[PDB]
Design a protein around this ligand. Structure first.
Ligand code: ADP
Lengths: 443, 98
């Protein structure tokens, strides 16, 4: 389909026993990281429980230790029930809006308003449309519709006859009509009428007739974020800015009104509030102004849980000239609990490579998996994982059905790991342009 | 003052004319269009031989003439000189056809 194979495609969940929060040694595509997966499952529990507002969790650990994987596992194990916003900290440096406004919109995106509504929908195969069009139009007309179980005829009001002519509704068309709006969606063409569709090309699909009653109440559970309500109220087609962007800085008094109205809908029981998650990937790309805003945004009642990942050690905080752990100011780190991801053992690398060799269509011979595991220890999990794809392409060039050691060796030879790449750089320092701008082009 | 026959005189003259004759009583071109109109709903770009539609007039006129005879017996069984739609409906239903 349109989803290709990607680095996280094998993550199907968090891999944790829902009855106990005990992490299984591997399941759902996660291997090891058990203590970190247990902690993320405790966070996941209190996300679903909703009662706790504006807690922040940092996932801290060396690169490739599964920090994004655990974040993706939580997203896959929340699903559609809960809003889940992913933010790269690079994204808030907008030219359209100040970074605290961009960071406000991200918090607003992570609270859902859940609204349950009904409508009568009429659905069936058109047996006939008669419209007289009697000079003017839409004067009178009759609609006959059937399911497999019923047939009925309807006199149409003139603004429904406009809708029918607008949708060029024809005998044999399978339609749904939302009655209160009066919009007509043509779900398809009935197969029994196929010969009447003389203009439709042979690529055309056909359907069986709808089943049961022509009319029923269908109930829709909408979830709309606070950000969407904010943007809708900004201007006469405010929602249109939810797509193009081109929201300005939305005025604070609009948000304050909406917070009051959503509290009214909750107290009236018309709507429910569904707190989600905001995940801030590589949070150390934020600067000191951002962290000062976050500190108090977290104290709002309508704050999501915020989950964060950092590769950084004791490192320079952006927008200042001093250093702190994770690159995050201590006053912000006081508001945050930290989950640590550790490096992998060789057998866990073997399992992750095996999983990645299942997610791509690759057969690894047992010695090729052993060699990739050895390369994984020596050159890192990500590099060996990229040798899987490379080896399959080399094997296919030699038309082999399984990837052999010869293919992994060609991969290791053709594509350098980060350390050999650095060693190549440290040898070529006269040919590579230095930090001084100096370079020699002679042989 | 011009003559005028009694109600039922020319009906009998018409019966005695059409039971004596064999020529077809439905008009040709109006029946061709009915056949082609019906055929369109089964398959586009069909053709009919002239003999195929003329064979098909002869079949259906005989069906209608034969049905009217059965309905006329249903009328006179109701002691009516006048055939009515429920006579058609009775005749076909006895025939297993309605
Ligand atoms: N415990 C694990 N189980 C399964 N796959 C993992 C695990 N840890 C890392 N990976 C995979 O290895 C790759 C690198 O890990 P990643 O989560 O990107 O590390 P980080 O985000 O800390 O750099 C990703 O494709 C990820 O899916």
């Amino acid at each position: 389909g349109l989803n290709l194979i990607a680095a996280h495609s094998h993550i199907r969940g968090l891999g944790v026993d829902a009855d106990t929060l005990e992490p299984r040694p591997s399941s759902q595509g996660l291997v090891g990281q058990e203590k970190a997966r247990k902690a993320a499952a405790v966070v996941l529990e209190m996300i679903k429980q909703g009662k706790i507002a504006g807690r922040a969790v940092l996932i801290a650990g060396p690169p490739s230790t599964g920090k994004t994987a655990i974040a993706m596992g939580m997203a896959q194990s929340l699903g559609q029930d809960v809003p889940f916003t992913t933010l790269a900290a690079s994204e808030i440096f907008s030219l359209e809006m100040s970074k605290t406004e961009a960071l406000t919109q991200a918090f607003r995106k992570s609270i859902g308003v859940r609204i349950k509504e009904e409508s009568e929908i009429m659905e069936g195969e058109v047996v006939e449309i008669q419209i007289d069009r009697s000079t003017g139009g839409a004067k009178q007309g009759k609609l006959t519709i059937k399911t497999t179980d019923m047939e009925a005829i309807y006199d149409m009001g003139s603004k429904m006859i406009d809708a029918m002519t607008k949708e060029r509704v024809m005998a044999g068309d399978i339609i749904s009509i939302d009655k209160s709006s009066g919009k007509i969606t043509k779900l398809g063409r009935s197969y029994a009428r196929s010969r009447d569709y003389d203009a439709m090309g042979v690529d055309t699909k056909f359907l069986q007739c709808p089943e049961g009653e022509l009319q029923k109440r269908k109930e829709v559970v909408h979830t709309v974020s606070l950000h969407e309500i904010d943007v809708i109220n900004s201007r006469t087609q405010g929602f249109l800015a939810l797509f193009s962007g081109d929201t300005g800085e939305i005025r604070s008094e609009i948000r304050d009104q909406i917070n009051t109205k959503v509290a009214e809908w909750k107290e009236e029981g018309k709507a429910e509030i569904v707190p989600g998650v905001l995940f801030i990937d590589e949070v150390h790309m934020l600067d000191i102004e951002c962290f000062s805003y976050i500190n108090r945004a977290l104290e709002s009642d309508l704050a999501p849980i915020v989950i964060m990942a950092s590769n950084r050690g004791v490192s320079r905080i952006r927008g200042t000239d001093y250093k702190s752990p994770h690159g995050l100011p201590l006053d912000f780190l006081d508001r945050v609990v930290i989950i640590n991801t550790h490096p992998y053992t060789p057998d866990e690398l073997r399992q992750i490579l095996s999983i990645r060799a299942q997610e791509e269509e690759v057969d690894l011979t047992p010695d090729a998996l052993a060699l990739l595991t050895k390369i994984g220890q020596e050159a890192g999990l990500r590099y060996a994982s990229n040798l899987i794809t490379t080896s399959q392409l080399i094997a296919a060039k030699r038309r082999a059905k399984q990837v052999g050691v010869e293919d992994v060796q060609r991969s290791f030879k053709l594509f350098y790991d980060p350390a050999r790449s650095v060693r190549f750089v440290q040898e070529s320092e006269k040919r590579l342009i230095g930090n001084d701008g100096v370079v020699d082009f002679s042989y | 003052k011009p003559h005028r026959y009694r109600p039922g005189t020319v009906a009998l003259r018409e019966i005695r004319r059409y039971q004596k004759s064999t020529e077809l009583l439905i008009r040709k071109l109006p029946f061709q269009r009915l056949v082609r109109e019906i055929a369109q709903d089964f398959k586009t770009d069909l053709r009919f031989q002239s003999s195929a539609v003329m064979a098909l007039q002869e079949a259906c006129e005989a069906y209608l003439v034969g049905l009217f005879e059965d309905t006329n017996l249903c009328a006179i069984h109701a002691k009516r000189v006048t055939i009515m739609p429920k006579d058609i409906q009775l005749a076909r239903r006895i025939r297993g056809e309605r």
